[PDB]
Structure 1
């Protein structure tokens, strides 16, 4: 084939694997938790409605994402 078509297939692979990585991160399935899995605080049922199966609060979730920003 051509030097463009190979690049098309590689770009499709790259965007596919990215999109699947970020669909895998979202939960949308699990059992209701009723309270944080880190601090014990309650998860308000609105946030649980937005994501079925939120193992964390918003506070602990933000904290964990924020430590993970430095990738450790």
Structure 2
């Protein structure tokens, strides 16, 4: 198995696992909520044109990402 084919299986498991773990965080189909779920701000219509199912607004999600940057 030449020691660089098991490397190939490990690397393809790495890429596929990471890319599936990202694509599960795209929340493709959802409901049109029109209001953010931590602020009640009107989420603009171009943003729902981008992502169907954004329960968070742009900058409250930005705050969520900045809080999740470290952990906890």
Q: Same fold (TM over 0.5)?
A: yes
1:10 shift after superposition: 0.3
C-alpha distance in structure 2 between counterparts of 1:15 and 1:27, whole Å: 20
Per-residue CA deviation, residues 11-70 of structure 1 (Å, 9 max, x unaligned), is 000000000001000011111110100010110010011000101100110000100001
Show structure 1 runs of 5+ residues with no match.
Answer: none
Aligned residue pair count = 72
Show structure 2 runs of 5+ residues with no match.
Answer: none
Alignment of 1:26-41 (within 5 A): 26-41=26-41
C-alpha distance in structure 1 between counterparts of 2:7 and 2:71, whole Å: 30
C-alpha distance in structure 1 between counterparts of 2:48 and 2:70, whole Å: 27
Could you say what the CA RMSD is over the residues aligned between the two structures, in angstroms? 0.6
TM-score of the pair, normalised by structure 1: 0.96
C-alpha distance in structure 1 between counterparts of 2:50 and 2:28, whole Å: 9
TM-score of the pair, normalised by structure 2: 0.96
Large movers: runs of 4+ above 2 Å: none
